[PDB]
Write an enzyme that holds these catalytic residues in place. Structure first.
Site, PDB file in Angstrom:
ATOM      1  N   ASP A 292      21.479 -11.536 -34.658  1.00  0.00           N
ATOM      2  CA  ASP A 292      21.599 -11.780 -33.017  1.00  0.00           C
ATOM      3  C   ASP A 292      20.022 -11.893 -32.741  1.00  0.00           C
ATOM      4  OD1 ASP A 292      24.025 -10.846 -33.258  1.00  0.00           O
ATOM      5  OD2 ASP A 292      24.094  -9.192 -31.956  1.00  0.00           O
ATOM      6  N   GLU A 294      17.415 -12.992 -30.547  1.00  0.00           N
ATOM      7  CA  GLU A 294      17.191 -13.436 -29.123  1.00  0.00           C
ATOM      8  C   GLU A 294      15.671 -13.648 -28.957  1.00  0.00           C
ATOM      9  OE1 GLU A 294      19.099 -10.411 -26.746  1.00  0.00           O
ATOM     10  OE2 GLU A 294      20.897  -9.904 -28.388  1.00  0.00           O
ATOM     11  N   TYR A 370      26.839 -13.530 -20.570  1.00  0.00           N
ATOM     12  CA  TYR A 370      26.460 -12.341 -19.694  1.00  0.00           C
ATOM     13  C   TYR A 370      25.151 -12.156 -19.379  1.00  0.00           C
ATOM     14  CZ  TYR A 370      26.858 -10.209 -24.373  1.00  0.00           C
ATOM     15  OH  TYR A 370      27.100  -9.886 -25.749  1.00  0.00           O
TER      16      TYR A 370
HETATM   17  C1  DM5 Z   1      19.168 -14.983 -17.676  1.00  0.00           C
HETATM   18  C2  DM5 Z   1      17.986 -14.934 -18.925  1.00  0.00           C
HETATM   19  O1  DM5 Z   1      17.577 -15.807 -19.394  1.00  0.00           O
HETATM   20  C3  DM5 Z   1      17.262 -13.445 -19.294  1.00  0.00           C
HETATM   21  O2  DM5 Z   1      16.207 -13.838 -20.432  1.00  0.00           O
HETATM   22  C4  DM5 Z   1      18.410 -12.570 -19.686  1.00  0.00           C
HETATM   23  C5  DM5 Z   1      17.708 -11.080 -20.229  1.00  0.00           C
HETATM   24  C6  DM5 Z   1      18.413 -10.379 -20.919  1.00  0.00           C
HETATM   25  O3  DM5 Z   1      19.478 -10.779 -21.382  1.00  0.00           O
HETATM   26  C7  DM5 Z   1      17.917  -9.099 -21.051  1.00  0.00           C
HETATM   27  C8  DM5 Z   1      16.659  -8.534 -20.296  1.00  0.00           C
HETATM   28  C9  DM5 Z   1      16.065  -9.400 -19.655  1.00  0.00           C
HETATM   29  O4  DM5 Z   1      14.962  -8.849 -18.919  1.00  0.00           O
HETATM   30  C10 DM5 Z   1      16.745 -10.505 -19.469  1.00  0.00           C
HETATM   31  C11 DM5 Z   1      15.753 -11.393 -18.446  1.00  0.00           C
HETATM   32  O5  DM5 Z   1      14.590 -11.939 -19.333  1.00  0.00           O
HETATM   33  C12 DM5 Z   1      13.252 -11.709 -18.759  1.00  0.00           C
HETATM   34  C13 DM5 Z   1      12.236 -11.521 -19.765  1.00  0.00           C
HETATM   35  C14 DM5 Z   1      12.044 -13.151 -20.299  1.00  0.00           C
HETATM   36  N1  DM5 Z   1      10.906 -13.153 -21.395  1.00  0.00           N
HETATM   37  C15 DM5 Z   1      11.599 -14.149 -19.104  1.00  0.00           C
HETATM   38  O6  DM5 Z   1      10.445 -13.678 -18.345  1.00  0.00           O
HETATM   39  C16 DM5 Z   1      12.914 -14.026 -18.048  1.00  0.00           C
HETATM   40  C17 DM5 Z   1      12.513 -14.756 -16.775  1.00  0.00           C
HETATM   41  O7  DM5 Z   1      13.229 -12.573 -17.719  1.00  0.00           O
HETATM   42  C18 DM5 Z   1      16.382 -13.063 -18.246  1.00  0.00           C
HETATM   43  C19 DM5 Z   1      16.400  -7.234 -20.849  1.00  0.00           C
HETATM   44  O8  DM5 Z   1      15.374  -6.697 -20.120  1.00  0.00           O
HETATM   45  C20 DM5 Z   1      17.048  -6.348 -21.587  1.00  0.00           C
HETATM   46  C21 DM5 Z   1      16.336  -5.206 -21.908  1.00  0.00           C
HETATM   47  C22 DM5 Z   1      17.170  -4.064 -22.869  1.00  0.00           C
HETATM   48  C23 DM5 Z   1      18.402  -4.460 -23.511  1.00  0.00           C
HETATM   49  C24 DM5 Z   1      18.819  -5.848 -23.261  1.00  0.00           C
HETATM   50  C25 DM5 Z   1      18.195  -7.055 -22.333  1.00  0.00           C
HETATM   51  C26 DM5 Z   1      18.794  -8.118 -22.086  1.00  0.00           C
HETATM   52  O9  DM5 Z   1      19.540  -8.414 -22.550  1.00  0.00           O
END
Ligand code: DM5
Length: 575
Positions: A292, A294, A370
């Site tokens: 995973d 990310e 999600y």
């Molecule tokens: C829709 C999308 O593409 C995202 O990246 C999804 C996402 C996310 O999946 C999680 C988180 C996010 O903050 C975000 C968002 O990223 C934030 C930080 C990125 N670097 C970027 O600035 C974006 C615009 O918002 C947007 C988490 O903070 C997070 C925290 C703890 C466990 C899982 C999570 C967790 O799973």
């Protein structure tokens, strides 16, 4: 005949032997705490105080001879090595020219990490989990999290194992750069530093050995002196109960992905891949590996990492290299091992990996359908919808439009179908894709009725901040709530709303919400209707099945709906 051996139970470690040595009552480096032996060293002391002692001893397990050696006078130690774990009836015999005499039988335990010495786990599953007859070809997956045994009080024997095909164990860290772990606060970063003391960078370790193998769970019959305890010994006992279950370690996740960005250098892949082979030889209940990362190309927890040019080809090589290594384990063991990965499904994550190349090495892709919208900003939306919601602007769904400032959208909107169709159109086979379902909501406060551009749709409002709540409500961090919290504090048993919340459903998007118009609290989640829509969609496209994050947060309703939505369907398993 010789005097019959009398076995000294206390001189022979009361007959409890283990192929794995696990440090207890301390926390140290992984290589100092865990030592695995291909053969257990069995030492059993016996005596023959009166009479003749004879010349030779033989050890039997369940009536079959497993060792032989010399008698040394009145006190002898039978010393031998043994590969197969299990519980056996042991007898020791002494022989000379006049005949042989044997001890009474006594049970010997040889522990191994496949759980071969354990009885099937006793379960304690919430009875709201119901029984189904889903075809065995369909994936029904979930993630069990190692820290769930603390505040969340959710242990391996709570899982509705008959309703699961795959359990992904979240999460195994990689030693090396891990600044993103400091974002969860607490002891997580420091516990990783401890685990990685004396471990090479880019090798896997267990993050929390208390939870993994030291903590005694009384429901599992653990005692303080039992040689393997924790969640790992319960997963071994669960595999004895459900032998066709696949249990797969998930490496990485949001907070533990920073080392993957250095896999552009093969040397660090080689280190990692070898450590995973060693890990799966050590912990034999596991059936493969899940990666995973990310995310290739960035956009995850580390704002200073991600290479759109090089991370995709590194991910593909990683998979190639891990499949070479798993093929070696299959040759060695005769077992089948799976290679899987959970991936981002926004267009800007998918464009950074040529999945048509990677997926030839992989059994399954767990598509993270999600987290599309959430409390990281103040823009409401559907976090786990199939399709584009009513709230989206013209041309937002396919990305041809412009936003409220007149700026081009940069790609298609974040929905499950936009990401599944981008994967299918580049040749990823549908029968390798597993669709994600959320057992939690994300939410906001301050979305009051005056902020809505369409009065019928709270996803057209604006928030002031993240949903706030307490752990008893299922809010373990601001902006995120367990599904069983939404059910107890916002839906009620009839699903018609309590505590000032109303329920709504976007029938275009296939997405539910609860909204308290007084507080402006708005939560986007998956419910029975939207999970039935995901199962219908999976059956329509021939996807491999469904998975969910995370199992402690369900009350049974979401996994039940995953099964209900799949009823009747079958799929071709990947070869
Ligand atoms: C829709 C999308 O593409 C995202 O990246 C999804 C996402 C996310 O999946 C999680 C988180 C996010 O903050 C975000 C968002 O990223 C934030 C930080 C990125 N670097 C970027 O600035 C974006 C615009 O918002 C947007 C988490 O903070 C997070 C925290 C703890 C466990 C899982 C999570 C967790 O799973």
């Amino acid at each position: 005949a010789p005097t019959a051996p009398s076995i000294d139970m206390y001189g022979s470690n009361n007959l409890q032997f283990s192929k794995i040595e696990l440090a207890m009552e301390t926390t140290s480096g992984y290589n100092d705490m865990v030592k695995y032996h291909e053969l257990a060293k069995i030492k059993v002391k016996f005596n023959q105080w009166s009479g003749t002692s004879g010349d030779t001893y033989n050890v039997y397990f369940d009536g079959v001879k497993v060792a032989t050696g010399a008698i040394t006078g009145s006190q002898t130690t039978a010393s031998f090595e043994y590969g197969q774990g299990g519980l056996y009836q042991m007898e020791i015999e002494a022989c000379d020219a006049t005949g042989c005499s044997k001890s009474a039988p006594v049970e010997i335990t040889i522990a191994d990490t496949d759980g071969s010495h354990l009885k099937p786990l006793t379960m304690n599953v919430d009875p709201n989990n119901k029984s189904y007859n889903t075809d065995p070809s369909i994936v029904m997956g979930t993630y069990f999290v190692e820290w769930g045994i603390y505040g969340r009080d959710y242990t391996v024997d709570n899982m509705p194992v008959d309703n699961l095909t795959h359990i992904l164990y979240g999460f195994i860290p990689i030693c090396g750069p891990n600044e993103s772990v400091k974002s969860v606060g607490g002891n997580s970063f420091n516990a990783l530093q401890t685990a990685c003391r004396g471990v090479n960078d880019y090798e896997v370790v267990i993050h929390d050995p208390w939870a993994a193998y030291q903590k005694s769970f009384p429901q599992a019959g653990h005692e303080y002196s039992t040689p393997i305890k924790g969640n790992y010994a319960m997963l071994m006992a669960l595999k004895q109960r459900n032998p066709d279950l696949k249990i797969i370690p998930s490496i990485g996740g949001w907070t533990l992905s920073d080392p993957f960005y250095d896999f552009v250098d093969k040397k660090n892949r080689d280190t990692f891949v070898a450590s995973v082979k060693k890990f799966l030889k050590t912990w034999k209940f596991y059936d493969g590996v899940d990666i995973d990362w990310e995310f290739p190309g960035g956009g995850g927890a580390a704002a200073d990492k991600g290479d759109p040019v090089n991370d995709g080809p590194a991910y593909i090589a990683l998979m190639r290299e891990l499949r070479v290594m798993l093929d070696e384990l299959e040759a060695e063991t005769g077992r089948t091992y799976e290679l899987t990965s959970a991936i981002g499904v926004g267009y800007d994550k998918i464009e950074d990996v040529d999945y048509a190349d990677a997926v030839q090495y992989m059994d399954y892709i767990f598509a993270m359908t999600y987290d599309f919208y959430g409390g990281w900003n103040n823009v409401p939306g559907h976090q786990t919808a199939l399709y584009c919601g009513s709230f989206m602007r013209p041309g937002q769904c396919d990305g041809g439009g412009v936003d409220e400032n007149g700026e081009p959208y940069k790609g298609p909107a974040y929905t499950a179908d936009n990401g599944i169709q981008l994967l299918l159109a580049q040749g990823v086979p549908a029968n390798k894709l597993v669709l994600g379902t959320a057992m939690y909501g994300r939410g906001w406060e301050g979305v009051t009725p005056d902020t809505l551009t369409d009065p019928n749709d709270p996803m057209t409002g604006t928030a002031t901040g993240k949903l706030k709540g307490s752990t008893a409500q299922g809010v373990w961090e601001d902006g995120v709530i367990d599904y069983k919290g939404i059910k107890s504090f916002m839906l009620g048993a009839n699903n018609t709303g309590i505590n000032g919340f109303e329920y709504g459903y976007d029938a275009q998007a296939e997405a539910p919400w609860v909204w308290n118009r007084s507080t402006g609290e708005l939560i986007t989640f998956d419910d029975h209707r939207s999970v039935l829509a995901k199962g219908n969609y999976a059956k329509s496209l021939g996807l491999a099945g469904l998975f969910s994050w995370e199992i402690d947060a369900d009350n049974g309703d979401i996994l039940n709906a995953m099964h209900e939505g799949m009823a009747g369907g079958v799929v071709t398993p990947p070869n």
